[PDB]
Short mmCIF file of C-alpha atoms in Angstrom, two decimals:
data_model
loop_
_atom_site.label_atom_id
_atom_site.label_comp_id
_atom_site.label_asym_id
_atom_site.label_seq_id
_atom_site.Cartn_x
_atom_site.Cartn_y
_atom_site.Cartn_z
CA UNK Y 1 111.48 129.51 120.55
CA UNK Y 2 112.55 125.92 119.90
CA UNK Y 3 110.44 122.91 118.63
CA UNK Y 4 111.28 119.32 119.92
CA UNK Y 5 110.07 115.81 118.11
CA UNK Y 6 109.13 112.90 119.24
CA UNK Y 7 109.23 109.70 117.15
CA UNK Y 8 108.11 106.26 116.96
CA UNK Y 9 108.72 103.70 114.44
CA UNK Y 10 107.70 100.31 112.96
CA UNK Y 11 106.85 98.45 110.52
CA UNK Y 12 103.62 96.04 108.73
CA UNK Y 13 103.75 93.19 106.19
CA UNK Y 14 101.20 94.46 103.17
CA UNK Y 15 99.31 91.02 103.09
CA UNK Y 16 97.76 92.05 106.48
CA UNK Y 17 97.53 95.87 106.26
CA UNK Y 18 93.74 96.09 105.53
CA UNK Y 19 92.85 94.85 109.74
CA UNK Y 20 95.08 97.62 110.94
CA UNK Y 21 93.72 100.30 108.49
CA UNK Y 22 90.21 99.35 109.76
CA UNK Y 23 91.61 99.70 113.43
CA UNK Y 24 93.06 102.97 113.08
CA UNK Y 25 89.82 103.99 111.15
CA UNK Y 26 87.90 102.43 114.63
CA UNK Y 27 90.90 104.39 117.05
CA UNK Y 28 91.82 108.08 115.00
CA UNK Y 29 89.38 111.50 114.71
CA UNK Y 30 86.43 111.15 112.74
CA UNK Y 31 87.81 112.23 109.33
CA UNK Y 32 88.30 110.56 106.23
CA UNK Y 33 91.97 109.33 104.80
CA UNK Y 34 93.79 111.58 102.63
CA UNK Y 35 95.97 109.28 100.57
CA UNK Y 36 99.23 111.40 99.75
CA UNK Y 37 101.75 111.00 97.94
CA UNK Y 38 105.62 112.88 97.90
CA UNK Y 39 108.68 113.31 95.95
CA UNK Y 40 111.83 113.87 98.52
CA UNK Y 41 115.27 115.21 98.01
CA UNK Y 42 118.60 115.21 100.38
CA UNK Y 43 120.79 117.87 100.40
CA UNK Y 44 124.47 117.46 101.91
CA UNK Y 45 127.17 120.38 102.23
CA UNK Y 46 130.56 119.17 103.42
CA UNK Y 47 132.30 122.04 104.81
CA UNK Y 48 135.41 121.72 107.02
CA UNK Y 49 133.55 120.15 109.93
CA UNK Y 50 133.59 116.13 109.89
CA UNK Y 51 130.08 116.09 110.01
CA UNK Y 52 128.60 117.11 106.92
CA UNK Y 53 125.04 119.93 107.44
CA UNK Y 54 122.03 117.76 105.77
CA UNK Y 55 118.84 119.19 104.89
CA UNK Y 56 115.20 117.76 103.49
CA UNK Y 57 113.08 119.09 100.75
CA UNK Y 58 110.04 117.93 99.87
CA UNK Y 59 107.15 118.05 97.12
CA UNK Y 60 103.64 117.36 96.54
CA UNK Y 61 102.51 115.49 93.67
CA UNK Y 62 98.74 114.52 93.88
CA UNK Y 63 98.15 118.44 95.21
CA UNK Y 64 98.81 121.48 92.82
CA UNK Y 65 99.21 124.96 94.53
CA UNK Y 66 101.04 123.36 97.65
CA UNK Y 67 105.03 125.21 98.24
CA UNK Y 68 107.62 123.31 99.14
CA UNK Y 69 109.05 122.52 102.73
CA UNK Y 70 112.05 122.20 103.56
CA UNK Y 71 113.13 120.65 107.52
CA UNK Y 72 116.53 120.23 109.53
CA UNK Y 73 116.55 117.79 111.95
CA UNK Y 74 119.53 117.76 114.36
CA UNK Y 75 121.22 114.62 116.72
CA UNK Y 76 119.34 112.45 118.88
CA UNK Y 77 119.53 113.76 122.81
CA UNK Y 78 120.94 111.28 125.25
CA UNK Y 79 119.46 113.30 128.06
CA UNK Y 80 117.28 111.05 130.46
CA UNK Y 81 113.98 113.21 130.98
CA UNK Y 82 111.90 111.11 128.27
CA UNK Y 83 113.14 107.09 127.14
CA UNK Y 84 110.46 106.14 125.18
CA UNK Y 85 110.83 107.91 122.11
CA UNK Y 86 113.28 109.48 119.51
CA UNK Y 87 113.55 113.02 120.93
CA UNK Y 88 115.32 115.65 118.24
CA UNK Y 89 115.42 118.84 117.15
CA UNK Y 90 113.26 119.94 114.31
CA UNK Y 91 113.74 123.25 112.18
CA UNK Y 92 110.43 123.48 108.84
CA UNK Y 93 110.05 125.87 106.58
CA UNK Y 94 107.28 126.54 103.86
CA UNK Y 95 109.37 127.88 100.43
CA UNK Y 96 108.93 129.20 97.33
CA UNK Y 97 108.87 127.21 93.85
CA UNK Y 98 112.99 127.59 93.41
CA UNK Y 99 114.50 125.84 96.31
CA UNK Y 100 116.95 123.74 94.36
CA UNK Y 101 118.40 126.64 92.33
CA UNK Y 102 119.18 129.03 95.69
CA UNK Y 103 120.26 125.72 97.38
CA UNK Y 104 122.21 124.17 94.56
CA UNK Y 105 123.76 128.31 94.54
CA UNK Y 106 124.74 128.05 98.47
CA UNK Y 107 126.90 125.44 97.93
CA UNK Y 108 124.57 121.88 98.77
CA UNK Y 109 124.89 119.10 97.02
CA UNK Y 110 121.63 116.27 96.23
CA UNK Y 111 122.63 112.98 97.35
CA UNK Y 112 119.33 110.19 96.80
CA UNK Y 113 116.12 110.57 96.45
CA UNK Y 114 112.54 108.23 96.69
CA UNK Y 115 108.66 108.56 96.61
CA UNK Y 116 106.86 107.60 99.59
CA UNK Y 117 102.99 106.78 99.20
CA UNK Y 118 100.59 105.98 101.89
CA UNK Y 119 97.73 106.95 104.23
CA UNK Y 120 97.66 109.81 107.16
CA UNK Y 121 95.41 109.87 110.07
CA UNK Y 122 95.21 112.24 113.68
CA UNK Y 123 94.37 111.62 116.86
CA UNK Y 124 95.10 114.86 119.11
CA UNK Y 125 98.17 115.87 119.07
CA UNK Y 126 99.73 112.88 117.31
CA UNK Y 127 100.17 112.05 113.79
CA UNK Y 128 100.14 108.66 112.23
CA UNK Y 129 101.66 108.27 109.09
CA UNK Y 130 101.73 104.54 106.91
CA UNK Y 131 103.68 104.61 103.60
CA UNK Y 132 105.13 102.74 101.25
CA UNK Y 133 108.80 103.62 99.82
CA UNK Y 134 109.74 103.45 96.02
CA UNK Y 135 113.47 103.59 94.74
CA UNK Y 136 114.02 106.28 91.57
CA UNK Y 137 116.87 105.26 89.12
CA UNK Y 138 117.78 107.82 85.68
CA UNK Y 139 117.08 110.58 88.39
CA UNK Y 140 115.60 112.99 85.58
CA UNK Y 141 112.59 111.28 85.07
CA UNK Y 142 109.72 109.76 88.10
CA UNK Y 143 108.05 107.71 86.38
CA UNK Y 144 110.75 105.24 86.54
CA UNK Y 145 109.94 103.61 90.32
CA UNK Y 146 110.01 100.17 91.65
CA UNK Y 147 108.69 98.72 95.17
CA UNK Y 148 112.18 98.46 97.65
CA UNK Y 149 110.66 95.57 100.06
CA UNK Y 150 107.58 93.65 100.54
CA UNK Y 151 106.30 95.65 103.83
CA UNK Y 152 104.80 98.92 104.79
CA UNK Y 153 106.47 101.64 107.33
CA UNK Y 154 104.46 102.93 110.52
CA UNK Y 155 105.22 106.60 111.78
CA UNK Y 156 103.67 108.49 115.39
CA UNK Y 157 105.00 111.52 115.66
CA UNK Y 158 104.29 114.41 118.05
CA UNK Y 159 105.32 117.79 117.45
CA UNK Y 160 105.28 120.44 120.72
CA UNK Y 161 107.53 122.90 122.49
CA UNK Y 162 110.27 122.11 124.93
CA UNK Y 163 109.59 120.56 128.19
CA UNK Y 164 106.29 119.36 128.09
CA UNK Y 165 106.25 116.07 129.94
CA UNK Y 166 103.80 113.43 130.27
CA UNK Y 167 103.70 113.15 126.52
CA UNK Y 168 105.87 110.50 125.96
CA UNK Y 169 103.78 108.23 128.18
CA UNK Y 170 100.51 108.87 126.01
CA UNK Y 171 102.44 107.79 122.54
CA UNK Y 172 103.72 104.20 124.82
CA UNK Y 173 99.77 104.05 125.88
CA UNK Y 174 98.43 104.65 122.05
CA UNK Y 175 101.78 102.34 120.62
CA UNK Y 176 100.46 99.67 123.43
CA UNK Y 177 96.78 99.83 121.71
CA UNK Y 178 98.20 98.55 118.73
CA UNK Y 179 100.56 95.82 119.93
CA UNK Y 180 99.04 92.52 118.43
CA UNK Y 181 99.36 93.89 114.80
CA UNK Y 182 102.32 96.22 115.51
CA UNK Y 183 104.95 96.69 117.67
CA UNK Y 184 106.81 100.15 117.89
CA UNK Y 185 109.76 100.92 119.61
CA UNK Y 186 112.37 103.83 120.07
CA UNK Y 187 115.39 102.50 117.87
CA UNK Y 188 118.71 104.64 117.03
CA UNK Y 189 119.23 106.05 113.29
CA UNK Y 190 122.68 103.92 113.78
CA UNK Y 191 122.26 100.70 111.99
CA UNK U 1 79.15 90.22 108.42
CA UNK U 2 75.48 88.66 108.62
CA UNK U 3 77.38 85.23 108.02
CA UNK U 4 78.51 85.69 111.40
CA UNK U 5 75.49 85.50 112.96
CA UNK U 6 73.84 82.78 110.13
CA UNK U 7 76.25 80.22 111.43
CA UNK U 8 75.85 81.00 115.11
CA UNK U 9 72.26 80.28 114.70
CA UNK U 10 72.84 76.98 112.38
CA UNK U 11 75.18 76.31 115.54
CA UNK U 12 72.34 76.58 117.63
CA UNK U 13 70.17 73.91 115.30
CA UNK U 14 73.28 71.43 115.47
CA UNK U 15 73.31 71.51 119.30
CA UNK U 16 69.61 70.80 119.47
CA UNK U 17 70.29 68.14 116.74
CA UNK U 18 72.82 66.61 119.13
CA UNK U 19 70.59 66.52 122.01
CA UNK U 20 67.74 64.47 119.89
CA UNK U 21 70.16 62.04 118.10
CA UNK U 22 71.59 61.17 121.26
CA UNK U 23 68.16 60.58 122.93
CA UNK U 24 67.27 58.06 119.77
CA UNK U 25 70.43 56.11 120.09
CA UNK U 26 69.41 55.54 123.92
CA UNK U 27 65.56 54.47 122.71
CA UNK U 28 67.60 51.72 120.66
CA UNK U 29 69.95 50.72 123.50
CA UNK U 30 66.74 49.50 125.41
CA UNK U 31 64.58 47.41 123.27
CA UNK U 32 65.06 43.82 123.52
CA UNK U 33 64.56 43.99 119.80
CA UNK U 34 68.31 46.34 118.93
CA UNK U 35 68.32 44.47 115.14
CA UNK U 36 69.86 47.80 113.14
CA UNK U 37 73.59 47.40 114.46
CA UNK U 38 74.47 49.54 111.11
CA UNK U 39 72.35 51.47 112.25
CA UNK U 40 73.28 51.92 115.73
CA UNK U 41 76.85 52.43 113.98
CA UNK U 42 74.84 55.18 112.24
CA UNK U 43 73.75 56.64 115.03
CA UNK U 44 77.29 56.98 117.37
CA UNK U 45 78.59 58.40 114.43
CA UNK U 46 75.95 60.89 114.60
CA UNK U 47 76.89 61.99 117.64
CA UNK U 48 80.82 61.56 117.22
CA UNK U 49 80.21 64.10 113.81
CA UNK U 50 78.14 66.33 115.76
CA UNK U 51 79.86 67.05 119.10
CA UNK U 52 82.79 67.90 117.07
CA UNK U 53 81.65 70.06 114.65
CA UNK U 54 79.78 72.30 117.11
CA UNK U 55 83.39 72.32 119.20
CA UNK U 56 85.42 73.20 116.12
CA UNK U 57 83.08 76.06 115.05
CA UNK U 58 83.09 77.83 118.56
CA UNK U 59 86.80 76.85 118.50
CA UNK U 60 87.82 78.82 116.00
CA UNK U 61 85.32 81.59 116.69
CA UNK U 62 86.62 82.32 119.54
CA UNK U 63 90.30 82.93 118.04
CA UNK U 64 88.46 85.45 115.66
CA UNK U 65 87.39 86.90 117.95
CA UNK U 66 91.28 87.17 119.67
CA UNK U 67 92.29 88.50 116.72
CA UNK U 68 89.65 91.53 116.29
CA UNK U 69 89.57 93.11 120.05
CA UNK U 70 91.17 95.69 121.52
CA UNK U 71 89.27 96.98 123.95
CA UNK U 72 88.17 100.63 123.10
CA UNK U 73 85.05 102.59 122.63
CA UNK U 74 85.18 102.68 118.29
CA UNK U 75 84.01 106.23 118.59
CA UNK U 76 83.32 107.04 114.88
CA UNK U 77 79.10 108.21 114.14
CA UNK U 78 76.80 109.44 111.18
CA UNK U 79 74.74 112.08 113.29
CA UNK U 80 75.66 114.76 110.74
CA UNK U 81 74.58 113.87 107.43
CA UNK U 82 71.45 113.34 109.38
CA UNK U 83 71.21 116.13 110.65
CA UNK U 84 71.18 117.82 107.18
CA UNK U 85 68.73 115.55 105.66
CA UNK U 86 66.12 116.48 108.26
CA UNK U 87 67.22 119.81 107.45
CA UNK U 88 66.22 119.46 103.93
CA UNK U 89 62.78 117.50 104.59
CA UNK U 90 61.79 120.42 106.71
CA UNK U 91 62.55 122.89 103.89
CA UNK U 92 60.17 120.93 101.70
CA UNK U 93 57.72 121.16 104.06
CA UNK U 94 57.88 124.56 104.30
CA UNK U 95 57.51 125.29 100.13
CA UNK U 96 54.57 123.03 100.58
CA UNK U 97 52.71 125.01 103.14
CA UNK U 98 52.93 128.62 101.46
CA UNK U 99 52.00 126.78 98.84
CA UNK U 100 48.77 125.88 99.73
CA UNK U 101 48.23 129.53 101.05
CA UNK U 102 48.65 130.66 97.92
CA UNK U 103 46.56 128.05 96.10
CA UNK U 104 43.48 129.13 98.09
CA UNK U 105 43.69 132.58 97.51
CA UNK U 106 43.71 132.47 93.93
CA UNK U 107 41.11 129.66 94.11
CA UNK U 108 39.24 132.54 96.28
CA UNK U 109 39.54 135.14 93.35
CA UNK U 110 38.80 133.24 90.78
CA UNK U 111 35.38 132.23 91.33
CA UNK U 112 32.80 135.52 91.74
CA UNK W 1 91.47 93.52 130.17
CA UNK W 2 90.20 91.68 127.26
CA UNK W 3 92.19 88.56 127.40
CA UNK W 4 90.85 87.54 130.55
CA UNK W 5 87.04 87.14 128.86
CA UNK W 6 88.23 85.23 126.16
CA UNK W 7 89.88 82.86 128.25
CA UNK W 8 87.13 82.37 130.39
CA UNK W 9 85.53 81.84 127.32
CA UNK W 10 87.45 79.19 126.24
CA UNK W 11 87.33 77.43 129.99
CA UNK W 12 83.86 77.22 129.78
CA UNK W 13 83.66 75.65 126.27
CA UNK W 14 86.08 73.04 127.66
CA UNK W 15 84.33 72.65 130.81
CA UNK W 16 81.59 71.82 129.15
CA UNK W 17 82.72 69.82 126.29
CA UNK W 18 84.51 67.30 128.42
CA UNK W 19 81.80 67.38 131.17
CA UNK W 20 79.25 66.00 128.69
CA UNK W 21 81.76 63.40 127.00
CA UNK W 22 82.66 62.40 130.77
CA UNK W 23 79.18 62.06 131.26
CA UNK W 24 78.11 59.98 128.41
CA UNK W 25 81.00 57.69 129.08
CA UNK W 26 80.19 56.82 132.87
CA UNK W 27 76.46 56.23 131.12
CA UNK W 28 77.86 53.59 128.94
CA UNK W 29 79.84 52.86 132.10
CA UNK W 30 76.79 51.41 134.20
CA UNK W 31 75.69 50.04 131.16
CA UNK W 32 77.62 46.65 131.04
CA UNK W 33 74.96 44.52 132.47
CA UNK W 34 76.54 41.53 134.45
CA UNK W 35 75.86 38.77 137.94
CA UNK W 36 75.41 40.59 141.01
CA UNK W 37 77.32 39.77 144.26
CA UNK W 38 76.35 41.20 148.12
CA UNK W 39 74.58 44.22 146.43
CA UNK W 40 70.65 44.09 147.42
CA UNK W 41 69.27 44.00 143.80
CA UNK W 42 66.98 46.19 144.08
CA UNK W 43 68.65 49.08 145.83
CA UNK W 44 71.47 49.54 143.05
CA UNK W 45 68.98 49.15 140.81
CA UNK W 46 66.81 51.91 142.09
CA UNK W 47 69.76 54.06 142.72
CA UNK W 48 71.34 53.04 139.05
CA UNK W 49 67.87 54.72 137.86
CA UNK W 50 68.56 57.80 139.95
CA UNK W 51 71.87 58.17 139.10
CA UNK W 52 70.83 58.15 135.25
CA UNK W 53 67.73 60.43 135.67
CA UNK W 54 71.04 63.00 137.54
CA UNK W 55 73.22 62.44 134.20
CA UNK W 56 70.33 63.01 131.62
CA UNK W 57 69.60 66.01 133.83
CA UNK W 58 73.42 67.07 133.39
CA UNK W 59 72.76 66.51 129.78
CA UNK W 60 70.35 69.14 129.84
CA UNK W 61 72.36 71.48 132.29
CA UNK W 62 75.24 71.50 129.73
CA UNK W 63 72.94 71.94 126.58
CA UNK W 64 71.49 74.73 128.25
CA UNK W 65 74.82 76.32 128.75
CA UNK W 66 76.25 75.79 125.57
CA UNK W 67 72.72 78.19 124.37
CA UNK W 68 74.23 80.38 126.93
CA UNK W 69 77.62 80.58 125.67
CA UNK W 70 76.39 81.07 121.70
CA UNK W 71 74.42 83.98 123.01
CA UNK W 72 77.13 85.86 124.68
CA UNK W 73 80.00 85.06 121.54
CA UNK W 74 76.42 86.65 119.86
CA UNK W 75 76.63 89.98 121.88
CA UNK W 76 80.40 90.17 122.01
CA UNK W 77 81.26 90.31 118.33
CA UNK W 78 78.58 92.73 117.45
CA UNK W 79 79.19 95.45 119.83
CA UNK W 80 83.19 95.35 119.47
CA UNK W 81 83.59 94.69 115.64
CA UNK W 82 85.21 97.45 113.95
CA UNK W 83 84.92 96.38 110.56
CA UNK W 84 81.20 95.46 110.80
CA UNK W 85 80.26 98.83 112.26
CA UNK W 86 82.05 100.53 109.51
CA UNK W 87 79.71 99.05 106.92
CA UNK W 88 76.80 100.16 108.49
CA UNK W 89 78.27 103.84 108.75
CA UNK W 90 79.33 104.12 105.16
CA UNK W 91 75.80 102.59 103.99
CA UNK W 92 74.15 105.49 106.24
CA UNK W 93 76.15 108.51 105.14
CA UNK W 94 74.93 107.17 101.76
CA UNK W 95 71.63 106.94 101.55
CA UNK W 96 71.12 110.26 103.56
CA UNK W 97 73.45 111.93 100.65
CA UNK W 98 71.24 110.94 98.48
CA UNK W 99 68.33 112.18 100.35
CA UNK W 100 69.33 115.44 100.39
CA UNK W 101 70.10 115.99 96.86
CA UNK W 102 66.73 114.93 95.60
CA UNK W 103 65.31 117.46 97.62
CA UNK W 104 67.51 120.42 97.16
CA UNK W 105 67.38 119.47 92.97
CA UNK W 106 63.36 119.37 93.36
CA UNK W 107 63.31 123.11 95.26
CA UNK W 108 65.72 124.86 92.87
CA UNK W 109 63.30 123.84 89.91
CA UNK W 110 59.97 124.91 91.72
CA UNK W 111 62.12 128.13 92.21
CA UNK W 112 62.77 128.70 89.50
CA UNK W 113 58.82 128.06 87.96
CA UNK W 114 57.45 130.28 90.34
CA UNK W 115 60.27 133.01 89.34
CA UNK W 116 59.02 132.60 85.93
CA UNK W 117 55.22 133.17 86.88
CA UNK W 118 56.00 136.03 89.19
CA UNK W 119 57.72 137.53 86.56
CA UNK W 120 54.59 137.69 84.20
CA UNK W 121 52.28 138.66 87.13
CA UNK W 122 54.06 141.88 88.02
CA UNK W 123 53.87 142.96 84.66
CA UNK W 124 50.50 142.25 83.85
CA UNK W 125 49.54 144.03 87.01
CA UNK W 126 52.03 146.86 86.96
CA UNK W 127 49.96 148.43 82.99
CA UNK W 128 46.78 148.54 84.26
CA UNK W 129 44.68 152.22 84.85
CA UNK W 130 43.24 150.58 87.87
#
């Protein structure tokens, strides 16, 4: 079948981040942060079409003996079943340990790249994600990172099948929990 | 976090403080005989010092207190770990008691 | 909701505040002794009395709710402080960690011992001609 996501975003100035990690400590499951940390790539193939087919790869750091994952994510739905949230299709894969090589071979091209690091927590079915986002220059090497802005990003994210209503009111209930410190809203990937 | 609850309390001593400097300023105000004007002086600003104090410390308490709520449960716990340590005291206990046993039957043999 | 409370909070503090200033201030208000005129000396002066015995005993009144007020700021922040209770649960998981490895460390060695022993029993029994 067919996967659906559903997205809300934000974000958090870093001078104040400590309150709202000890809120979502007090809020989220009982388990413990796991602190990851990500190299990313883009991939872009520019057929014919005028929209060029974009992919995401991704890579694990901090973890050894982890494979790579690759995801497709296609246009925004203007349907008006759920307005609350970003709702898109999402394709992920788990891959072997030579995804460039057979992608670089199909004909994509790499476009940017960056390092996210941050903190992950659950609650349910929803996934809260805060990060930070570094900028890579001399693309060989990653060692070579600086800071891009002087504030944190906030991701919830639910993952489930299609239909399945009633969802997108339990993300604006959760989002509403955390409005003095954060405010999340649906906003379009267009500027 | 026990701060908190140390100034609450010293709040507490300042209002009582309040109550009994204000009660001394009105045994002055009644004897023919009111000769320490300072002070008197001394005393109003006693009270002036004290009243506001107390309001500025439940002041701002209060907007600490409308920064940190959000009306929820909290509903993290520590029943596990606990639940293994009692685990592990009653394995102890256990190795003590067959240890005994044992104890008295050699102490049994050894002895004719 | 929450922001209801708080603001009732903050009424009461007010209330109270300006009730005992108000109070204090009518005191010295009565206070400026002058000449009498068609007043019956001695019934203002009885009821003057009364009416400052009333104010001392709003005095009181408002001390007394002030004590109330500290005690329920007392109960409120300790029951819905999230970073507070988190100390206390990372202290907790602690100590009980440590707890437990004392006593697993102390059977594994008297485990061990007694293998030992048990060893050097079996054999000293098992030669015998009985």
């Amino acid at each position: 079948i067919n996967m659906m996501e559903y997205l809300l975003q934000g974000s958090v100035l870093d001078h104040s981040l400590e309150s709202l990690i000890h809120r979502l400590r007090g809020l989220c499951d009982n388990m413990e942060p796991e602190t990851f940390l990500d190299h990313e790539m883009v991939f872009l193939l520019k057929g014919q079409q005028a929209s060029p087919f974009v992919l995401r790869a991704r890579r694990s750091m901090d973890r050894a003996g982890a494979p790579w994952h690759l995801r497709y994510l296609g246009q925004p739905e203007m349907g008006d079943k759920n307005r609350h949230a970003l709702v898109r299709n999402c394709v992920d894969i788990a891959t072997s340990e030579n995804l460039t090589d057979f992608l670089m071979e199909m004909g994509f091209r790499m476009d940017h790249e960056f390092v996210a690091k941050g903190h992950l927590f659950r609650k349910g079915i929803m996934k809260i994600m805060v990060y930070k986002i570094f900028r890579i220059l001399v693309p060989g090497n990653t060692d070579s990172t600086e800071a891009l802005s002087l504030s944190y990003l906030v991701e919830l994210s639910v993952v489930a099948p299609a239909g399945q209503d009633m969802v997108s009111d339990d993300m604006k209930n959760f989002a509403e929990q955390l409005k003095p410190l954060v405010h999340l809203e649906k906003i379009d990937p267009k500027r | 976090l026990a701060n908190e609850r140390l100034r609450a309390l010293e709040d507490i001593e300042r209002e009582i403080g309040a109550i009994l400097q204000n009660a001394g300023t009105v045994i002055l105000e009644l004897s023919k005989e009111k000769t320490n004007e300072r002070l008197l002086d001394r005393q109003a600003a006693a009270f002036t010092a004290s009243v506001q104090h107390v309001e500025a410390e439940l002041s701002a308490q209060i907007r600490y207190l409308t920064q940190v709520a959000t009306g929820q449960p909290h509903e993290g716990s520590s029943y596990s770990s606990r639940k293994d340590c009692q685990m592990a005291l009653k394995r102890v206990d256990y190795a003590r008691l067959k240890l005994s046993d044992v104890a008295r039957t050699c102490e049994q043999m050894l002895e004719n | 909701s929450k922001e209801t409370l708080l603001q009732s909070y903050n009424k009461r503090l007010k209330d109270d505040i300006k009730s005992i200033m108000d109070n204090f201030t009518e005191i010295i208000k009565t206070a400026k002794i002058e000449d009498e005129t068609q007043v019956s000396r001695a019934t203002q002066g009885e009821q003057d009395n009364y009416e400052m015995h009333v104010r001392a005993a709003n005095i009181v009144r408002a001390g007394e709710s002030l004590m109330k007020l500290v005690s329920d700021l007392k109960q409120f922040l300790i029951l819905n402080d999230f970073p507070s209770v988190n100390e206390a649960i990372d202290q907790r998981n602690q100590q009980l960690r440590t707890l437990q490895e004392e006593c697993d460390r102390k059977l594994i060695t008297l485990r061990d011992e007694i293998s030992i022993d048990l060893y050097e029993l079996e054999e000293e029994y098992y030669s015998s001609s009985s």
